[PDB]
């Protein structure tokens, strides 16, 4: 997953020493982009300030622009920090604050500072007005290379989850059609959930395909 996070880390380290504003690092739920963007955000040495998606929409109205202009006030006044948001009428006001944001980033050029690192857990719905260099431009899907990378990030993300030493990775790597490694991680979650009633304390090989055919 270095081919998609390398551009992010470089893009957020270069202003401290224009950087891309919107990078879409997406994938199925349970991918681990928060623990890898935090495992690398700790290596960026900057201030790790957390922010979520539904935090903009609140009980009162007009709070989205309050948290956007407030996060851009603490970020505009403070040093270059790390803000990672996830799970990106009210939407008309979000488009007013968005077109105003890119009107201050396209009509003006003061944003030599922190950016908006956005990440979505599903790309079934995509606004056609999100296509620009300042908008979500780098849309990198799951890595096309072989299973090895999936076993590496899945093993690092699953260090506490043992594996029976009879696995070729070719059957599970081949059966997954139009699938990603996060869905296989959920397959490992369900397989480990039924591993209690299976009676075997060690996750077997057939439980992987049993989970694939179970949840997907």
């Amino acid at each position: 997953l270095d081919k998609q996070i390398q551009e992010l880390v470089e893009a957020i380290v270069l202003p401290m020493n224009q950087p891309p504003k919107g990078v879409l690092m997406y994938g199925p739920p349970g991918t681990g982009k928060t623990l890898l963007a935090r495992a690398c955000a700790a290596q960026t040495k900057a201030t790790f300030l957390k922010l979520a998606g539904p935090q903009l929409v609140q009980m009162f109205i007009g709070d989205g622009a309050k948290l956007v202009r407030d996060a851009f006030a603490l970020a505009k006044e403070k040093a270059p920090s790390i803000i990672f948001i996830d799970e990106l009428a009210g939407d008309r006001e979000v488009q007013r604050t968005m077109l105003e944001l890119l009107n201050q980033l396209d009509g003006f050029q003061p944003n030599t500072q922190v950016k908006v690192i956005a990440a979505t857990n599903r790309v079934d719905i995509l606004d056609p007005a999100l296509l620009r260099s300042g908008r979500l431009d780098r849309k990198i899907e799951f890595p096309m290379p072989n299973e090895e990378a999936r076993a590496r990030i899945m093993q690092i993300h699953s260090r506490k989850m043992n594996v029976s030493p009879d696995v070729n990775y070719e059957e599970l790597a081949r059966c997954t059609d139009d699938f990603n490694g996060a869905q296989c991680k959920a397959v490992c979650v369900e397989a480990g959930m039924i591993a209690l009633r299976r009676g075997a304390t060690e996750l077997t090989h057939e439980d992987y395909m049993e989970g694939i055919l179970e949840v997907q």
């Binding site: 470089e10 270069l14 202003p15 020493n17 224009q18 950087p19 008309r92 488009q95 007013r96 077109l99 105003e100 009107n103 201050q104 396209d106 009509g107 003006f108 050029q109 030599t112 056609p128 296509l131 620009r132 260099s133 908008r135 431009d137």
Partner: protein, 211 residues
Amino acid sequence: KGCLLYGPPGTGKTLLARAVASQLDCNFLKVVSSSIVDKYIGESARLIREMFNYARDHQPCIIFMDEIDAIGGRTSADREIQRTLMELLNQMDGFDTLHRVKMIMATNRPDTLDPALLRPGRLDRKIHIDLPNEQARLDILKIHAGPITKHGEIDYEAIVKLSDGFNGADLRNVCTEAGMFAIRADHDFVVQEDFMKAVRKVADSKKLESK
């Protein structure tokens, strides 16, 4: 107190209009094209008197009006638009000394531009945005490349030739894009290698995502 910026020859009307606008502007008051549909009761009149009343409280201001062709009809969809046009007539042609106020109007084609609104006074000076000339691209490159640091070797023909269909704001953000790309390695000087690489790659990203 008005200006018209149309781009019939093709794309670049908002890029060059927002390039000169990006060069000089005033207090920020944007009119989004989604705040006039008014799906509920058509009470947009008090919203126009309210926003422009704030434009009366603040003496200096520039009001951007982009993509006016959809609200430039010469059903009930156009009746509220013409109502906002009557509020504009009674708003700037009313009994008020609104001389310091300024506005900018942009469109796509000079054929359905409300020839009643095309009367002098309503839009004093209009600039016909044509296709980007190579001499205005070399000039805009020589005036947008001044304050940015560069190396002793200068070759502008690669930046003029490798950039097509761009305006002052595009070539501005792409040349400064290459300046930041070359300052990533915190070097005081900027060799034109990063100019060619970042202008080529980012220029291709703008040609692909130029919608």
